[PDB]
Structure formats: C-alpha cells, structure tokens
Ligand binder design. Structure first.
Ligand SMILES: [Cl-]
Length: 141
C-alpha cells in the first residue's frame, strides 16, 4: 500500500521539478538571442550558458539535473554582473522579462526540491524494512 503510494508521491514531486527545468532550458535560446543583440563579444558567458543548457538537456538523474541547474544559475548570475557593463541590455524589456521568468523558475525549483527531497526521505525510509532507493535533488562535487 504505502510503497506504491510513497513511490507515487516521489514521482509526482519529481515531475514538478522536471517541468521547471524544462521551462528553464526552453527560455535560454531567447535570452542568448537578446544578449547577442547588445553584446556580441561576451562569447565566453554565452558559451557557459549554452553548455549548462545542454547539461540540463542531457541529465539522466536527479543529481545530474541539480548539478546542471547549479551550473546554469551560476552562469546566469555571472551574466547579470556582465550586463552592468551594458546599460541598454540591462534596461531591455525582453532581457528583464526573461531574467525575471528565469528567477521565478528557480524560486519554484527551490520549493519543489524541498517537497521532492521530503518524499524521497519517507520513501527511502519505508523501503528499509521493484522499489529502489531514490536520489535526492542535490548537486554533488
Ligand atoms: Cl536563475
């Protein structure tokens, strides 16, 4: 009874995370386009962003997706510091709307990660008495 239903919860909370990560990856091409419009010579940061998108696209496991998401968040923070050198970019409405949507997704991921890891703990705890231990959403070193 409980294993099936606890497994069920783990999976439903996981899809909340996946839905946000997918939206994150989806917004990235538009962002890159907007940045290139104002700052074509900031190639390193645009590459870092593209790389983290691909990592997110290829992630197989919760740990890999979390690591990929942290790489993205870090590259987004670095983009924002760089944007200070480009006032017209910093003021661009599409750029602001996009960094705001991206921050919103990440803030959602924060909540959804706590719900997921809560369901992972109950689940893993129950199985310690077809049902495999699940990974926590967290980036390892
Ligand atoms: Cl972010």
């Amino acid at each position: 009874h409980h294993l099936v239903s606890l497994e069920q919860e783990v999976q439903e909370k996981y899809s909340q995370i996946q839905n946000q990560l997918q939206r994150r990856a989806d917004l990235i091409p538009n962002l890159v386009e907007t940045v290139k419009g104002y700052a074509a010579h900031e190639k390193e940061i645009l590459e870092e962003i593209a790389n983290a998108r691909a990592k997110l696209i290829g992630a197989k496991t919760p740990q890999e997706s979390a690591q990929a998401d942290a790489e993205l968040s870090s590259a987004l923070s670095r983009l924002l510091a760089i944007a200070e050198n480009y006032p017209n970019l910093k003021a661009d409405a599409n750029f602001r709307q996009l960094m705001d949507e991206l921050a919103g997704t990440e803030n959602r991921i924060a909540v959804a990660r706590r719900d997921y890891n809560e369901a992972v703990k109950k689940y893993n705890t129950a199985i310690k008495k077809g049902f495999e231990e699940k990974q926590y959403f967290e980036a390892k070193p």
